[PDB]
mmCIF file of all heavy atoms in Angstrom:
data_model
loop_
_atom_site.group_PDB
_atom_site.id
_atom_site.type_symbol
_atom_site.label_atom_id
_atom_site.label_comp_id
_atom_site.label_asym_id
_atom_site.label_seq_id
_atom_site.Cartn_x
_atom_site.Cartn_y
_atom_site.Cartn_z
ATOM 1 N N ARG A 29 0.849 -1.182 0.000
ATOM 2 C CA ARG A 29 0.000 0.000 0.000
ATOM 3 C C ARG A 29 0.886 1.234 0.000
ATOM 4 O O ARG A 29 2.099 1.147 0.190
ATOM 5 C CB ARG A 29 -0.931 0.026 1.214
ATOM 6 C CG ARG A 29 -0.262 0.525 2.482
ATOM 7 C CD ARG A 29 -1.204 0.475 3.674
ATOM 8 N NE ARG A 29 -0.903 1.511 4.659
ATOM 9 C CZ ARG A 29 0.051 1.421 5.579
ATOM 10 N NH1 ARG A 29 0.812 0.338 5.652
ATOM 11 N NH2 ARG A 29 0.247 2.420 6.428
ATOM 12 N N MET A 30 0.277 2.395 -0.208
ATOM 13 C CA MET A 30 1.029 3.636 -0.126
ATOM 14 C C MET A 30 1.372 3.920 1.328
ATOM 15 O O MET A 30 0.501 3.871 2.200
ATOM 16 C CB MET A 30 0.246 4.804 -0.717
ATOM 17 C CG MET A 30 0.922 6.150 -0.516
ATOM 18 S SD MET A 30 0.317 7.427 -1.628
ATOM 19 C CE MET A 30 0.876 6.773 -3.192
ATOM 20 N N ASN A 31 2.644 4.204 1.587
ATOM 21 C CA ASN A 31 3.077 4.443 2.956
ATOM 22 C C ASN A 31 2.586 5.786 3.479
ATOM 23 O O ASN A 31 2.100 5.870 4.612
ATOM 24 C CB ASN A 31 4.600 4.357 3.042
ATOM 25 C CG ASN A 31 5.142 4.918 4.333
ATOM 26 O OD1 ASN A 31 5.979 5.818 4.326
ATOM 27 N ND2 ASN A 31 4.663 4.394 5.452
ATOM 28 N N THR A 32 2.701 6.842 2.675
ATOM 29 C CA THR A 32 2.430 8.178 3.193
ATOM 30 C C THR A 32 0.936 8.454 3.308
ATOM 31 O O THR A 32 0.515 9.222 4.178
ATOM 32 C CB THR A 32 3.116 9.225 2.317
ATOM 33 O OG1 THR A 32 2.825 10.533 2.822
ATOM 34 C CG2 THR A 32 2.680 9.107 0.867
ATOM 35 N N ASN A 33 0.122 7.847 2.449
ATOM 36 C CA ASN A 33 -1.326 8.009 2.511
ATOM 37 C C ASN A 33 -2.016 6.837 1.831
ATOM 38 O O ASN A 33 -2.073 6.783 0.599
ATOM 39 C CB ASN A 33 -1.764 9.318 1.859
ATOM 40 C CG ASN A 33 -3.268 9.452 1.795
ATOM 41 O OD1 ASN A 33 -3.981 9.016 2.700
ATOM 42 N ND2 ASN A 33 -3.760 10.069 0.732
ATOM 43 N N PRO A 34 -2.588 5.914 2.600
ATOM 44 C CA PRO A 34 -3.137 4.688 2.009
ATOM 45 C C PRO A 34 -4.389 4.906 1.187
ATOM 46 O O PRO A 34 -4.830 3.987 0.488
ATOM 47 C CB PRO A 34 -3.423 3.822 3.242
ATOM 48 C CG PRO A 34 -2.655 4.462 4.356
ATOM 49 C CD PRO A 34 -2.717 5.913 4.061
ATOM 50 N N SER A 35 -4.983 6.097 1.251
ATOM 51 C CA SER A 35 -6.147 6.395 0.431
ATOM 52 C C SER A 35 -5.808 6.561 -1.040
ATOM 53 O O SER A 35 -6.729 6.632 -1.858
ATOM 54 C CB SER A 35 -6.824 7.665 0.931
ATOM 55 O OG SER A 35 -6.124 8.804 0.472
ATOM 56 N N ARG A 36 -4.527 6.639 -1.396
ATOM 57 C CA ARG A 36 -4.120 6.855 -2.775
ATOM 58 C C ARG A 36 -3.379 5.678 -3.394
ATOM 59 O O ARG A 36 -3.128 5.699 -4.601
ATOM 60 C CB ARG A 36 -3.222 8.097 -2.872
ATOM 61 C CG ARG A 36 -3.958 9.418 -3.032
ATOM 62 C CD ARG A 36 -3.057 10.578 -2.610
ATOM 63 N NE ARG A 36 -3.456 11.868 -3.170
ATOM 64 C CZ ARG A 36 -2.677 12.626 -3.937
ATOM 65 N NH1 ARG A 36 -1.451 12.231 -4.245
ATOM 66 N NH2 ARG A 36 -3.123 13.787 -4.394
ATOM 67 N N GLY A 37 -3.028 4.664 -2.614
ATOM 68 C CA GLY A 37 -2.201 3.588 -3.104
ATOM 69 C C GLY A 37 -2.959 2.590 -3.947
ATOM 70 O O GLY A 37 -4.008 2.894 -4.519
ATOM 71 N N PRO A 38 -2.423 1.378 -4.057
ATOM 72 C CA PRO A 38 -3.120 0.328 -4.805
ATOM 73 C C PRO A 38 -4.438 -0.044 -4.144
ATOM 74 O O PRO A 38 -4.488 -0.418 -2.973
ATOM 75 C CB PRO A 38 -2.126 -0.834 -4.776
ATOM 76 C CG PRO A 38 -0.808 -0.170 -4.634
ATOM 77 C CD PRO A 38 -1.052 0.978 -3.710
ATOM 78 N N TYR A 39 -5.515 0.067 -4.916
ATOM 79 C CA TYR A 39 -6.862 -0.170 -4.412
ATOM 80 C C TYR A 39 -7.142 -1.667 -4.468
ATOM 81 O O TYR A 39 -7.645 -2.200 -5.455
ATOM 82 C CB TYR A 39 -7.872 0.636 -5.212
ATOM 83 C CG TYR A 39 -7.845 2.105 -4.884
ATOM 84 C CD1 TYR A 39 -8.151 3.055 -5.842
ATOM 85 C CD2 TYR A 39 -7.497 2.541 -3.619
ATOM 86 C CE1 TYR A 39 -8.123 4.398 -5.546
ATOM 87 C CE2 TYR A 39 -7.467 3.879 -3.312
ATOM 88 C CZ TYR A 39 -7.779 4.803 -4.279
ATOM 89 O OH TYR A 39 -7.751 6.142 -3.974
ATOM 90 N N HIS A 40 -6.800 -2.350 -3.377
ATOM 91 C CA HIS A 40 -7.025 -3.784 -3.248
ATOM 92 C C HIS A 40 -8.514 -4.080 -3.201
ATOM 93 O O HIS A 40 -9.200 -3.655 -2.270
ATOM 94 C CB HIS A 40 -6.370 -4.312 -1.977
ATOM 95 C CG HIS A 40 -5.171 -3.533 -1.551
ATOM 96 N ND1 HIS A 40 -3.941 -3.674 -2.149
ATOM 97 C CD2 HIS A 40 -5.017 -2.594 -0.589
ATOM 98 C CE1 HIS A 40 -3.077 -2.862 -1.570
ATOM 99 N NE2 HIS A 40 -3.705 -2.194 -0.620
ATOM 100 N N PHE A 41 -9.026 -4.798 -4.189
ATOM 101 C CA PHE A 41 -10.423 -5.200 -4.205
ATOM 102 C C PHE A 41 -10.538 -6.581 -3.577
ATOM 103 O O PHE A 41 -9.604 -7.382 -3.657
ATOM 104 C CB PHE A 41 -10.977 -5.196 -5.625
ATOM 105 C CG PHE A 41 -11.182 -3.821 -6.183
ATOM 106 C CD1 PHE A 41 -10.214 -3.233 -6.976
ATOM 107 C CD2 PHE A 41 -12.337 -3.113 -5.910
ATOM 108 C CE1 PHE A 41 -10.396 -1.965 -7.488
ATOM 109 C CE2 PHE A 41 -12.525 -1.843 -6.421
ATOM 110 C CZ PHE A 41 -11.552 -1.270 -7.211
ATOM 111 N N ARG A 42 -11.674 -6.848 -2.943
ATOM 112 C CA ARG A 42 -11.862 -8.098 -2.227
ATOM 113 C C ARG A 42 -12.847 -9.035 -2.907
ATOM 114 O O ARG A 42 -12.815 -10.239 -2.633
ATOM 115 C CB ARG A 42 -12.334 -7.812 -0.805
ATOM 116 C CG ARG A 42 -11.415 -6.897 -0.030
ATOM 117 C CD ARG A 42 -10.159 -7.629 0.405
ATOM 118 N NE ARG A 42 -9.019 -6.743 0.637
ATOM 119 C CZ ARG A 42 -8.905 -5.874 1.637
ATOM 120 N NH1 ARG A 42 -9.852 -5.756 2.556
ATOM 121 N NH2 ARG A 42 -7.817 -5.127 1.731
ATOM 122 N N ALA A 43 -13.714 -8.521 -3.764
ATOM 123 C CA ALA A 43 -14.708 -9.360 -4.415
ATOM 124 C C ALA A 43 -14.026 -10.276 -5.422
ATOM 125 O O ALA A 43 -12.976 -9.914 -5.959
ATOM 126 C CB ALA A 43 -15.753 -8.490 -5.107
ATOM 127 N N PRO A 44 -14.567 -11.470 -5.684
ATOM 128 C CA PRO A 44 -13.952 -12.347 -6.694
ATOM 129 C C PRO A 44 -13.933 -11.750 -8.087
ATOM 130 O O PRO A 44 -12.939 -11.901 -8.808
ATOM 131 C CB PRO A 44 -14.825 -13.607 -6.637
ATOM 132 C CG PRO A 44 -15.476 -13.568 -5.316
ATOM 133 C CD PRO A 44 -15.671 -12.132 -4.976
ATOM 134 N N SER A 45 -15.010 -11.067 -8.480
ATOM 135 C CA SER A 45 -15.081 -10.483 -9.815
ATOM 136 C C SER A 45 -14.101 -9.334 -9.971
ATOM 137 O O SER A 45 -13.392 -9.244 -10.979
ATOM 138 C CB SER A 45 -16.501 -10.010 -10.104
ATOM 139 O OG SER A 45 -17.423 -11.062 -9.930
ATOM 140 N N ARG A 46 -14.049 -8.441 -8.989
ATOM 141 C CA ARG A 46 -13.141 -7.313 -9.100
ATOM 142 C C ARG A 46 -11.695 -7.751 -8.956
ATOM 143 O O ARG A 46 -10.799 -7.060 -9.449
ATOM 144 C CB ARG A 46 -13.488 -6.241 -8.066
ATOM 145 C CG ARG A 46 -14.982 -6.015 -7.826
ATOM 146 C CD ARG A 46 -15.754 -5.691 -9.098
ATOM 147 N NE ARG A 46 -15.101 -4.658 -9.886
ATOM 148 C CZ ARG A 46 -15.357 -3.361 -9.774
ATOM 149 N NH1 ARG A 46 -16.260 -2.934 -8.904
ATOM 150 N NH2 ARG A 46 -14.710 -2.492 -10.536
ATOM 151 N N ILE A 47 -11.451 -8.887 -8.302
ATOM 152 C CA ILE A 47 -10.137 -9.513 -8.370
ATOM 153 C C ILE A 47 -9.844 -9.954 -9.793
ATOM 154 O O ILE A 47 -8.782 -9.649 -10.348
ATOM 155 C CB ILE A 47 -10.050 -10.688 -7.380
ATOM 156 C CG1 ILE A 47 -9.766 -10.177 -5.971
ATOM 157 C CG2 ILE A 47 -8.977 -11.678 -7.791
ATOM 158 C CD1 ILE A 47 -9.929 -11.229 -4.907
ATOM 159 N N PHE A 48 -10.790 -10.655 -10.417
ATOM 160 C CA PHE A 48 -10.607 -11.076 -11.797
ATOM 161 C C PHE A 48 -10.633 -9.887 -12.750
ATOM 162 O O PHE A 48 -9.960 -9.900 -13.783
ATOM 163 C CB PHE A 48 -11.679 -12.097 -12.173
ATOM 164 C CG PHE A 48 -11.857 -12.253 -13.644
ATOM 165 C CD1 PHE A 48 -10.887 -12.881 -14.401
ATOM 166 C CD2 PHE A 48 -12.980 -11.760 -14.276
ATOM 167 C CE1 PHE A 48 -11.038 -13.018 -15.757
ATOM 168 C CE2 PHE A 48 -13.135 -11.896 -15.633
ATOM 169 C CZ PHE A 48 -12.163 -12.526 -16.375
ATOM 170 N N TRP A 49 -11.402 -8.849 -12.422
ATOM 171 C CA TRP A 49 -11.381 -7.640 -13.238
ATOM 172 C C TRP A 49 -10.039 -6.934 -13.153
ATOM 173 O O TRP A 49 -9.613 -6.290 -14.117
ATOM 174 C CB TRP A 49 -12.501 -6.699 -12.809
ATOM 175 C CG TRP A 49 -12.427 -5.367 -13.453
ATOM 176 C CD1 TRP A 49 -12.902 -5.028 -14.680
ATOM 177 C CD2 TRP A 49 -11.850 -4.184 -12.901
ATOM 178 N NE1 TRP A 49 -12.650 -3.702 -14.932
ATOM 179 C CE2 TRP A 49 -12.006 -3.163 -13.851
ATOM 180 C CE3 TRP A 49 -11.216 -3.891 -11.694
ATOM 181 C CZ2 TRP A 49 -11.556 -1.868 -13.633
ATOM 182 C CZ3 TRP A 49 -10.767 -2.607 -11.480
ATOM 183 C CH2 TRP A 49 -10.937 -1.613 -12.445
ATOM 184 N N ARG A 50 -9.362 -7.048 -12.012
ATOM 185 C CA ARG A 50 -8.072 -6.392 -11.841
ATOM 186 C C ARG A 50 -7.010 -7.039 -12.719
ATOM 187 O O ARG A 50 -6.196 -6.346 -13.341
ATOM 188 C CB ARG A 50 -7.664 -6.436 -10.370
ATOM 189 C CG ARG A 50 -6.233 -6.016 -10.093
ATOM 190 C CD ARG A 50 -5.962 -4.580 -10.511
ATOM 191 N NE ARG A 50 -4.540 -4.284 -10.476
ATOM 192 C CZ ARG A 50 -3.887 -3.916 -9.379
ATOM 193 N NH1 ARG A 50 -4.534 -3.786 -8.234
ATOM 194 N NH2 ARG A 50 -2.587 -3.667 -9.429
ATOM 195 N N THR A 51 -7.010 -8.370 -12.795
ATOM 196 C CA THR A 51 -5.992 -9.030 -13.597
ATOM 197 C C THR A 51 -6.243 -8.841 -15.087
ATOM 198 O O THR A 51 -5.303 -8.924 -15.880
ATOM 199 C CB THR A 51 -5.893 -10.513 -13.237
ATOM 200 O OG1 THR A 51 -4.716 -11.064 -13.837
ATOM 201 C CG2 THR A 51 -7.082 -11.287 -13.730
ATOM 202 N N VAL A 52 -7.485 -8.563 -15.487
ATOM 203 C CA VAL A 52 -7.732 -8.182 -16.872
ATOM 204 C C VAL A 52 -7.176 -6.792 -17.140
ATOM 205 O O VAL A 52 -6.620 -6.527 -18.213
ATOM 206 C CB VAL A 52 -9.237 -8.277 -17.189
ATOM 207 C CG1 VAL A 52 -9.532 -7.774 -18.589
ATOM 208 C CG2 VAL A 52 -9.713 -9.709 -17.055
ATOM 209 N N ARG A 53 -7.280 -5.895 -16.157
ATOM 210 C CA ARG A 53 -6.740 -4.551 -16.318
ATOM 211 C C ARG A 53 -5.221 -4.575 -16.404
ATOM 212 O O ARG A 53 -4.623 -3.703 -17.044
ATOM 213 C CB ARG A 53 -7.220 -3.658 -15.168
ATOM 214 C CG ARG A 53 -6.973 -2.158 -15.359
ATOM 215 C CD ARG A 53 -5.701 -1.652 -14.709
ATOM 216 N NE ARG A 53 -5.712 -1.800 -13.256
ATOM 217 C CZ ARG A 53 -6.240 -0.914 -12.413
ATOM 218 N NH1 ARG A 53 -6.796 0.194 -12.886
ATOM 219 N NH2 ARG A 53 -6.200 -1.127 -11.101
ATOM 220 N N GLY A 54 -4.580 -5.566 -15.786
ATOM 221 C CA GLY A 54 -3.153 -5.733 -15.974
ATOM 222 C C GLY A 54 -2.765 -6.127 -17.383
ATOM 223 O O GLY A 54 -1.685 -5.745 -17.844
ATOM 224 N N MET A 55 -3.630 -6.864 -18.081
ATOM 225 C CA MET A 55 -3.370 -7.327 -19.438
ATOM 226 C C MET A 55 -4.042 -6.434 -20.471
ATOM 227 O O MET A 55 -4.509 -6.909 -21.507
ATOM 228 C CB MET A 55 -3.824 -8.772 -19.609
ATOM 229 C CG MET A 55 -3.320 -9.690 -18.525
ATOM 230 S SD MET A 55 -4.175 -11.270 -18.530
ATOM 231 C CE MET A 55 -3.562 -11.998 -17.017
ATOM 232 N N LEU A 56 -4.089 -5.137 -20.198
ATOM 233 C CA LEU A 56 -4.834 -4.196 -21.013
ATOM 234 C C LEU A 56 -4.144 -2.847 -20.934
ATOM 235 O O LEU A 56 -3.660 -2.467 -19.862
ATOM 236 C CB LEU A 56 -6.285 -4.116 -20.517
ATOM 237 C CG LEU A 56 -7.421 -3.474 -21.302
ATOM 238 C CD1 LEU A 56 -8.717 -3.976 -20.720
ATOM 239 C CD2 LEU A 56 -7.392 -1.963 -21.207
ATOM 240 N N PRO A 57 -4.083 -2.098 -22.036
ATOM 241 C CA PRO A 57 -3.457 -0.766 -21.988
ATOM 242 C C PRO A 57 -4.418 0.302 -21.477
ATOM 243 O O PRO A 57 -4.875 1.175 -22.215
ATOM 244 C CB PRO A 57 -3.049 -0.548 -23.450
ATOM 245 C CG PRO A 57 -4.084 -1.265 -24.224
ATOM 246 C CD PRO A 57 -4.532 -2.443 -23.395
ATOM 247 N N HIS A 58 -4.718 0.235 -20.180
ATOM 248 C CA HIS A 58 -5.754 1.071 -19.590
ATOM 249 C C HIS A 58 -5.391 2.546 -19.574
ATOM 250 O O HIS A 58 -6.289 3.390 -19.509
ATOM 251 C CB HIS A 58 -6.032 0.603 -18.170
ATOM 252 C CG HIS A 58 -4.888 0.836 -17.240
ATOM 253 N ND1 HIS A 58 -4.803 1.950 -16.434
ATOM 254 C CD2 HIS A 58 -3.759 0.123 -17.016
ATOM 255 C CE1 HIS A 58 -3.687 1.898 -15.732
ATOM 256 N NE2 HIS A 58 -3.034 0.802 -16.068
ATOM 257 N N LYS A 59 -4.104 2.883 -19.628
ATOM 258 C CA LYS A 59 -3.719 4.288 -19.611
ATOM 259 C C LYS A 59 -4.049 4.997 -20.916
ATOM 260 O O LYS A 59 -4.051 6.231 -20.953
ATOM 261 C CB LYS A 59 -2.230 4.417 -19.311
ATOM 262 C CG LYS A 59 -1.831 3.891 -17.947
ATOM 263 C CD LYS A 59 -1.947 4.961 -16.881
ATOM 264 C CE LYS A 59 -1.375 4.478 -15.561
ATOM 265 N NZ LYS A 59 -0.175 3.621 -15.752
#
């Protein structure tokens, strides 16, 4: 997580779908 302010760091999702949605975003040019 972000050390100085955790509200801005990696947004860890807990749901199974948003976990699977996150790994799709890794394999995608989202920027």
